[PDB]
Structures are given as structure tokens and as C-alpha cells.
Amino acid sequence: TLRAAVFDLDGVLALPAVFGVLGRTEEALALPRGLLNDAFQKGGPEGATTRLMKGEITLSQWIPLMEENCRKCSETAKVCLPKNFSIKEIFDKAISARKINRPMLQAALMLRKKGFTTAILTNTWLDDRAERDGLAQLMCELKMHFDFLIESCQVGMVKPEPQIYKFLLDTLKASPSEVVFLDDIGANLKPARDLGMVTILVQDTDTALKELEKVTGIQLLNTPAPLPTSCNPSDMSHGYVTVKPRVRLHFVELGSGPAVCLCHGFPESWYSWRYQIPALAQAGYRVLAMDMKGYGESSAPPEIEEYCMEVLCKEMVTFLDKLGLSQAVFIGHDWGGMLVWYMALFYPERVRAVASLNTPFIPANPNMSPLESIKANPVFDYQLYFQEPGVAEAELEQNLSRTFKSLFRASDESVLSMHKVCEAGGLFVNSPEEPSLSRMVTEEEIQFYVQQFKKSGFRGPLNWYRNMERNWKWACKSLGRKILIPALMVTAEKDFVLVPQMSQHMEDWIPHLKRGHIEDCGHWTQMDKPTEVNQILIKWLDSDAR
Amino acid sequence: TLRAAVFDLDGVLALPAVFGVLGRTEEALALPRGLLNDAFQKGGPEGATTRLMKGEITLSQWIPLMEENCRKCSETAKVCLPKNFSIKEIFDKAISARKINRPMLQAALMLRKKGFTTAILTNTWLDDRAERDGLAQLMCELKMHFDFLIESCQVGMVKPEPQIYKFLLDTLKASPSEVVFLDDIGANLKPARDLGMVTILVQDTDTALKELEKVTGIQLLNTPAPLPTSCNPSDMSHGYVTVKPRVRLHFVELGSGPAVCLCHGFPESWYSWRYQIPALAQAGYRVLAMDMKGYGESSAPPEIEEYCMEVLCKEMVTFLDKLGLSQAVFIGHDWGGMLVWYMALFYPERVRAVASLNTPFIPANPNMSPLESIKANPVFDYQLYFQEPGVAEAELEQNLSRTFKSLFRASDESVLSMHKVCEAGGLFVNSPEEPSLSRMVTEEEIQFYVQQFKKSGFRGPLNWYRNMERNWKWACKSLGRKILIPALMVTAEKDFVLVPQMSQHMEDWIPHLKRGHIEDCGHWTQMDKPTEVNQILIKWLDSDAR
Numbered sequence A, B: 001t002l003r004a005a006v007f008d009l010d011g012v013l014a015l016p017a018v019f020g021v022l023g024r025t026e027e028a029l030a031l032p033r034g035l036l037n038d039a040f041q042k043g044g045p046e047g048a049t050t051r052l053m054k055g056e057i058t059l060s061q062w063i064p065l066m067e068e069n070c071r072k073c074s075e076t077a078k079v080c081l082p083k084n085f086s087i088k089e090i091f092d093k094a095i096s097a098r099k100i101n102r103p104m105l106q107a108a109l110m111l112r113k114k115g116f117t118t119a120i121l122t123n124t125w126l127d128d129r130a131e132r133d134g135l136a137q138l139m140c141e142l143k144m145h146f147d148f149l150i151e152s153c154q155v156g157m158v159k160p161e162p163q164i165y166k167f168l169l170d171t172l173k174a175s176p177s178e179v180v181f182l183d184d185i186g187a188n189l190k191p192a193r194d195l196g197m198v199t200i201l202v203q204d205t206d207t208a209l210k211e212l213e214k215v216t217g218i219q220l221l222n223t224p225a226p227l228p229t230s231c232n233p234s235d236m237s238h239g240y241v242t243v244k245p246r247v248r249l250h251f252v253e254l255g256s257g258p259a260v261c262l263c264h265g266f267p268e269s270w271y272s273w274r275y276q277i278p279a280l281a282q283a284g285y286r287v288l289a290m291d292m293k294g295y296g297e298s299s300a301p302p303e304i305e306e307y308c309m310e311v312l313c314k315e316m317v318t319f320l321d322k323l324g325l326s327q328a329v330f331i332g333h334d335w336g337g338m339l340v341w342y343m344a345l346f347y348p349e350r351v352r353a354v355a356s357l358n359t360p361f362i363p364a365n366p367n368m369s370p371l372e373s374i375k376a377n378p379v380f381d382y383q384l385y386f387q388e389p390g391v392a393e394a395e396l397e398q399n400l401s402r403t404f405k406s407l408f409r410a411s412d413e414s415v416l417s418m419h420k421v422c423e424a425g426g427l428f429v430n431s432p433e434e435p436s437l438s439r440m441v442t443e444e445e446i447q448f449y450v451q452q453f454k455k456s457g458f459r460g461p462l463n464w465y466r467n468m469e470r471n472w473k474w475a476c477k478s479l480g481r482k483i484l485i486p487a488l489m490v491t492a493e494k495d496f497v498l499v500p501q502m503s504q505h506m507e508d509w510i511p512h513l514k515r516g517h518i519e520d521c522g523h524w525t526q527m528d529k530p531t532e533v534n535q536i537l538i539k540w541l542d543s544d545a546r
Ligand SMILES: CCCc1cc(C2CCCCC2)c[nH]c1=O
Pocket: A362, A363, A364, A370, A373, A374, A380, A464, A465, A467, A468, A469, A471, A472, A475
């Protein structure tokens, strides 16, 4: 019975294979068939290619030896290699054209999700080319989805030598009969088969995956669309910045490129962006996923005033100052969305671009006020319930698991009767004691939020709603301004509080505003529709944020 | 008696002044004298410029109002503005040409070092231009050297209104007679003077600084060359990555740009790079200053094998993997220098560029060994003393303050008799009980190292020297390779162990090797000659690391 799956890289997890380029170059340059492939394998286990694959020499040392083999082969074949013949150019192109075989990676992901130990076993080189970063990125994206990466040049052994197969089994801590091994080179399957492993000669992916599901008894083909990569809290880089004597800000950090600062809403965490973090880092951005003031590992002072928008914005500016960042793109959701618009209004020099999920840009009415406005719309009643210190805290802190299970639900699954929260005396007066698990969350993800809120609870988070008169006065100073920096507004169809129609007048204040819209999406945007959120943000980032 | 110094920005801390561009544009376009300056100030306190300076409107909203004032002024003067006349182009250029007035900044730095409270008081705008980042960077570099930054557009008040002066005094918590105020606009000095503050009308910097030193009694002019900006540990962003179950790695992070991973030697800290960190971040790099395994906030496992080069390198690769970095430039000193060369030899795909301070590239002799080689050269005797577990630990841990005071000394100041460490039974057998403070370090910097080594001591750090046979075997696998990625070797004249002549054969292994060399520089390169280290690294980074 199988418990391990091993994948080759070239021709299996990455396509097109580099071996197929040697053939394509012969045909294009009308060279004798197999001349390039023969110079490549010249001298078998004694040759330059084996020394390269074993880690004896680097790719740049190998290039001239391949040229000499190419010359030797052309001489024997009584032919002449062209004028502009360059091994470097051929291999540079081949490596750059090679992409992840997404359906093969998904099958490996599905196998690992069902309890399989997964590994990449590859014959590779030590790449010292000026352009090595391309391959370095490919190996990075790939390796993180597997338990083991075994590279010939790092282990000093090569496929098809029997030693590498014994090394593989040892690494996996599995007997040969419990291993499926997938390779596009028949010669490399032979020793795995001889040892008793299940082998699959990979020609086209579909057939290979049909064999893979037949042998494992797990559906890998015709599978529903997978969710994006999520985050394991313990595998992230955690950062800590003191912004003032009693205030430290915590964040999770992933990627290189322009800085993208993610700002969650109420009552959330950096972990609310778990499905965006690997995606935005992969798209070429440096992600800074915040624990906002009052949350997780960030400080949670008890004073209401500590959570007014002016103080919160000033602290985010200091946060940039202490990290040495002149700008960041600011992306917010719910309360984080309100803050990002105010970051754009008050500090446009520090904001590369601004995007909000659900939260429209709410300009202060100097004639009315937020209190009067909140009373006018029954959907905002819960904000009045949040006013009196202690009341909402007691209900939200009573049973943490019930709190997040009741809150973190899709539009259909909801248990909250938003209209009369004050009258009924609570958000969960009609919610069960043991809510069911929403289709959006696992038990483990709920438990991460539970552990996070054990430190400071709901005082600091609730205080974000207790600064209406303070925020209104501060906002009124911006009544003559406009947002003229790149901006994105993302509406959610089924958000019953932050309704799409609430954003209809935003172009008056933000004339160059770009939009995004997600159908069948509730309040918890990032986890409700992760794939579509990622697609909207990546498209807007690449076009408007550089 | 003075205790506060206030500086204006345009024409004082930054040059050339933007007001001087309006005059230069009139002369270049042969326009009537003062036309551009008059359209700029049109309507005084009621005008568009005042609304901009108070934060009522953004720079992009102001541009069209300035054009209309320019039209109105040209009409009255019975003249015509040119065809290609654009306020945006003029201001874009003016802002970009404006640089920090380095001698004025040094005087502010010297005043702050002597106990003065320093502030920037400026009439500025909310910059929403596509090119705002330039100014955002200037304000960033500048603000960090002052206690306060007061911006008109953020306080809704403007110079010369008396309210801003009362706001300034309140912020400073100082009476007017204790304040020096420097401005290039006579009209803006007037209210400060009226209140009783010492004022300086800044025309040329030299004269202004002569007045400033005459009034404060502190030497600001003709001062010795200042050291680069250092780091305050509590103001840095601290990062933590788990690289394996029992190993977490700590680092300090500053800047945006290509990742630059700094690797200290023995017995050091991330803080050994304190003079390089602000400099390299300012030069356009993302600095990652490590606490290497066994040091500071990084884990310190007790087992010798945990500190062999193979394990240490694998962990640095995982460190990159967990941060989502495909590459970093690796810069090392002493033991960190040895590791960076091995990172280049074994993982060239993950290394953008490699630089070493003092440590040459030491290729294994398959015929000899490191033990035999270490015995052959008496300067390396201390490494034999480091072999026996517990012995070096007892001496180094006995009195931490004495340890770092005895070690961290320039070549002349040294108290160690390196030749016979074993024979004499210790590194400090001829060092005083209370060593004097070296010219390179303050009491506070020594105390930071003391507090750092209180956590794990010298076991983990000493174990880096206890892997000779393990490192030799691993290194022998690389005997056929070459380092062909961008590489820099920096030698130190007065290092008595890692002597410059030890690097003389490096070109055999690294043919494209670039070099740097520092005269009158001992073992502690980074703190001995910080200005020259910064100059060598920045020059090589900008030319070879992108
Ligand atoms: C700057 C506005 C201040 C503010 C607005 C709101 C609401 C008002 C109704 C529309 C959505 C935001 C809640 N809390 C606040 O502090």
C-alpha cells in the first residue's frame, strides 16, 4: 500500500523538458539527428554531463566542455556546426521557456493532502549563470509544496545509479512497495522498478495522472478547482517594530519586490490574508501582512483614543519609517479598508497605491456626523451595540470558538440577525451554542483565531468603533482634497453591511478609481472568494503599482 | 541658555531651494522678473498656495490653480507665457534637483549629540504626484536624525502665522529664549524673534553655521570627519524565522531593494554591522543583518555538529526559502566570511553576489587538512585553544565586559599575545582585569554585547571552530569547482590573523574576483573603518549586484 509519491523535475513537474530542446535545435538548425543529445551524454558515467550532475563542476564550467563534445560529434558525422552556434544561448532559452506543469503539481498537492509523503528527485546542476535567478525562482515555488527535494549535484549521486534510489528510500523512511515513482526517462524508472517501487513512465501528463490515480485510489484528474496556497503560521517570517514606547506592531513577511502592506478588519488577524500572502509574493511583491493595533502579537493598549484613525495612521507611517520604506501599497478590508483610504488622504507620499475590499471611501458629512448616519441605516445597528465599553466584550469573549464560528460564515450560512442587535441585546442571542463549521473554514483555522484572541480579547479591537466623533473632526480637514494616487475599490455582492451600492459616489472623490466586483461573496472576502481576490489584486498591482 | 535647534527645510536642510527655481525659470524663459514668484504667492493668506501649505488641497489640485494665477499675472504684465509652459515640469525638476545640505545636517547631528532637542519646521504640501517617492525618500533620510518633524500641511497652520510658533514651543517643551531657529525667509524669522527666540537668517551655509556655533558655544564648523549613522537596537525591525524544529534565526531588517544578507564573525552580533545597516539601506538595498546560529536572539543548540558549514549553509538556504527570497547578496566577516564563500560554492543559484571582509577563500587541501595547516602557522594557535569543550567557554564567560573590552580593540591598542595562547593557558592571561575602552567602542556598545552573550554564552559560537574534519570532508567535494558569480574580497592591513597575503591565490579559484583594501584596519573591520567599508561595499553593490 502506497504512502509516498516521487516526482522527477524535467518532463514531469516542469515543461517543456530541456532534453526536448536539444532535438528542437537540431531540427531548426537542420543538424544531423541526435547530434546535440549525443554530445550531451558523451562518455556516459565518465563524461562532463555526469560530473556536472554529481556537483563536481558548475554549469559555467560545463558549457565549454559541451562545445568541445559538440565539435567532436560534428567532426565524426562529417558535418559543420553553424557560425552563431552557442550552447549558452540554447540552454538560457530552454531554462527560461521551462514552466511548472500545473496539473502534475496539483496531483502532488492532492496526494500530500491525503497523507502522502512527497518528494522531488532530480538530476540537476549547480547553476552559476548570470541568469540563474529564473531557475532559482522555479525551484523555490516548487520545493515548498513537497516534503523533500533531492538534487543529484547536492548528493553527489546520479539517476540511474542504484545508490540514489537507496538514498531516496532512506530519506522517505519507506519500503519500495509503498512508493510511486514518476519519471519521463525509461532508463531512470528501471532501478526503482527493480527495487519493487510502483513506476510511471510520464509521456503526456493526463495518461500519467490516470495511472497515478488508478494505482493510489485517489481522484487526481477532473477534480474541483483547488483553493490557493494558504499559510502555516509557524513557517512564516515574523517581524516586530516598536512604533512608540507602549506600542509594538507585529507582521508576517513574504517575498521580494515593491512592499504591499495588508490591513485586516474586525475581529481579524494577519492570517485573514493567508490565501493572498503566497499568491502576492509569487506575483513579485514583498508582502507585509499586519496584526493591526489591538490584535494578535501587536500591542493592545486599553484607552479608546489609542484607536482613533489619526493615531492609527501616524503609527503606520512610523512603521514605514522604522523598516526604512519610503512607500508601500496599502490594501485593506473592513476597518483596514477605512484606514487605507485615510492613509491615501493624509499621507499620499507614503502610499504607492491604495486598494480596499468591501469598505467604500466614506467622506465626513460636516453637516451630519457618523452617529446620526449610523442610526439612519438599520444594518449599522451593531456599531451602536459596540459603543458601551464592556458589553460587546463580555459577549465576544464568553466563548471564543462560538464567536469565530458564528461570525466567519458565508452569506447563506449566516446566523446573525443584524437588524436588531441592541433591542435583542447581542449579536449571538439567536445563534446556537455550538455553531456548525462554515464551508469557508476548518476547525484548525478557527482555533488559530481563538488562540490569538486569548492574549488581549476584544477591548482594543472594539475601540476602533469607539472613535466616531474624533474621526469625524479629523476627516473634516480632508473635505477639500481628492484621492489622485492609483486606487482600487473591490465590492462584494452579498456583504449585507458594506453593500456595493454604498461605493457608488466614490468617483466624485477618486476620479481615476479602478473597480473590481465579486459575485456571491459575503463580508469575509479573502476566505470566501480567495482565487478571485488574488486575480483582482494581482492584475491591478501589475498594471497600477509597478 | 539654548537647548533646542529648529531648522527650516527648503533653503536650510535641503538645497537648492524651490523658490530659487521660480527665479531661474523666469530668467531662462526671459519672462518678466518675479512673475512666477508673484503667481505663486497670489492672494497671500487667502490664495491657493496657503490652502496647499495648510493641507486643504493636494499638490495635484494646486497645479491647475497655479497655471491660472500664472495666466492672470502674464495678462496684467502685458506679456505671453511660452507654448511649452508647464508648472508640473518646473516643480518636478525643482523637487528632484533638491538634495540634503550635508553640512547643515551634520551641524544638527552635532547639536543633537551634545544634548540639544532638534526639529524641522516646514511649510510643505501633501504630495500626490506620480513622482512623489523622490521627496518621500528625502523626508525619510532627513526626519530620522531629528526629534520632531513639523509640517504645515499636517498641522493646518503655516509660517509666518504666530500659532505655528506657539505649536513649535509646545512640541519642544521649551521657552523661546532656549531656542535657535534657522530660516532662509526673513518674514518667517520675524515671529520667532518677536517671541524671544535666537534667529539665524540662512543665506550661505558657512555664515549660518558660524552664527550657530557662536550662539551655542559648540564647534560645528571645521569639525573632524563624522562616523556614519549607527543603529539603536530598540528602533529596528526585528525578524524571526524557524529554519528547523529546534532552530530559529533572528535578524534586523532595514530598506527596500535587492536583499543583502550580512553575516558576522566570532564572537559577534547583528550589531557588528551597525555602521553599515543605515548606509546600505540608504544606498537602495534591503538589509538583513543576521544573528548567526549560536548568537543573540538566534537559537544556540549545544551539539558541535550543529555548527558545521554544511548544516549552517543549509539553514541559510531554508532562511531564504521561508522569507520567499530566491537570492540575496551575501556579505560576511571572519566566520561569516567563510560561510559566504561556501554559500557561493554550494548554492550559486541563491547567491546574487558574494563579498568577504578579511576572510580569504580557503580551499581544502585534500593532501593536508585544516588541523595540520593550523599547527603550521603560530597566529592560528588560538583555534587549537578553542578545540577542547569548556576551556575557552570558562575564560570567555568569566567576565563578559572584560572579554569584549579586551577583544574589541584596534591593532595598536591590542592586549592579546596570539602566538602562545595554549602555552600561557588563555587569551587574556596578560590582559588587565579592567581593560580600558578602545577608541572604536563606547561603554554602551560593549554593554549591548554583554547583554547579548548572557543568554547562550560561548558554547554555540565556539562550536563554529570545532568542525575542522567535518568541514574539510565537505569542502573536498568542491575541489573541481570555481566561483564565477560576482565576488569581492576586502583585505585589512593590520589584521594579524587574517593577513592580506593569505588571499593572494584567490584568483585561481575566483578569476573575475574584485578587490578592496583598507589601510590601518585591524580585525574588527566594520567598526575600525566604517566609512571606508561603506564606500567599498556600496561601490561594488551598485556595479556588480544591481
Ligand atoms: C471618518 C468616518 C468615521 C467613522 C465612520 C463610520 C461609518 C459611518 C457610516 C458609513 C460607513 C462608515 C464608522 N466609524 C467611524 O469612526
